[PDB]
Amino acid sequence: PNFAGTWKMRSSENFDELLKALGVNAMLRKVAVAAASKPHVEIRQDGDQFYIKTSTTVRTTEINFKVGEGFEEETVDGRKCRSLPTWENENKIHCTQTLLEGDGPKTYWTRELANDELILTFGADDVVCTRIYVRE
Amino acid sequence: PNFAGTWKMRSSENFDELLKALGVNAMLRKVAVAAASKPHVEIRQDGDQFYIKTSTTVRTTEINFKVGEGFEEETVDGRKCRSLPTWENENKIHCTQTLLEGDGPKTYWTRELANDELILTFGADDVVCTRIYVRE
């Protein structure tokens, strides 16, 4: 299969740590780590084109991009950045991030479909956060 | 009557603008606001000694203080600070907050009893947030 479908999170790891790497203070980190486990992701994949919805029942964050062409979004902690997606290999998109406002930790994310699970990985320098998604 | 009792919140205005004054980026600000939207206050009063337990799903604080002498707590955005609670008038507590480390916008809070309503006011520079509680 491809990345298309509805995904529910199975497990998260080192997320709080990543947020610290990105400078989010203890309290905000805490509200942030909590709110991250509630949404369900819905991916629409069409070739290199993606449309991802990270929703709930009263909220929804939507974004589209095309693998192979830069686009703009926001780093996990809410900073503005230009992103560059490329296919590392058939089952894995790698995306480099470069901040627009200011200078800080090198951010990056990758999405990989392995064993029918979606493994999202966040990088904030030497810190790496990982989360696994299972088809709902 | 007095400040003692169990409280519920019926209104919050300019909260988001408060956090913005405090430097919280759009994303975090959104989540922070959502988290503090259904507070449950429990106040125990003994003359000038106060006990204010504020339980919200992700964060509970049990602040103890004596109007007339300082104490320590955290600003609404998580900065360490020294607070000075004092009577602005017979039924209003004004509280000055000093950042122990960091240094940012001047913040403070006031808690007033007007018609069996607990007006919790937060301020940061020119921005002011107002939340009204009612007896549960």
From Swiss-Prot, chains A, B:
PROSITE patterns cross-referenced by the UniProt entry: FABP
Organism superkingdom: Eukaryota
Gene Ontology MF annotations: retinal binding; retinoid binding; retinol binding
Keyword Cytoplasm: yes
Family matches, as InterPro entries: Calycin (IPR012674), Fatty_acid-bd (IPR000463), ILBP (IPR031259), Lipocln_cytosolic_FA-bd_dom (IPR000566)
SUPFAM superfamilies: Lipocalins (SSF50814)
Keyword list, A-Z: Cytoplasm, Retinol-binding, Transport, Vitamin A
Residues the entry annotates as binding all-trans-retinoate: R131, I132, Y133
Compartments, record wording: Cytoplasm
UniProt short sequence motif Nuclear localization signal, positions renumbered to this chain: 20-30
Assigned protein family: Belongs to the calycin superfamily. Fatty-acid binding protein (FABP) family.
The protein's role, per its UniProt record: Cytosolic CRABPs may regulate the access of retinoic acid to the nuclear retinoic acid receptors.
Entry comment, domain topic: Forms a beta-barrel structure that accommodates hydrophobic ligands in its interior.
Protein name: Cellular retinoic acid-binding protein 1
Species, as recorded: Mus musculus
Underlying gene: Crabp1
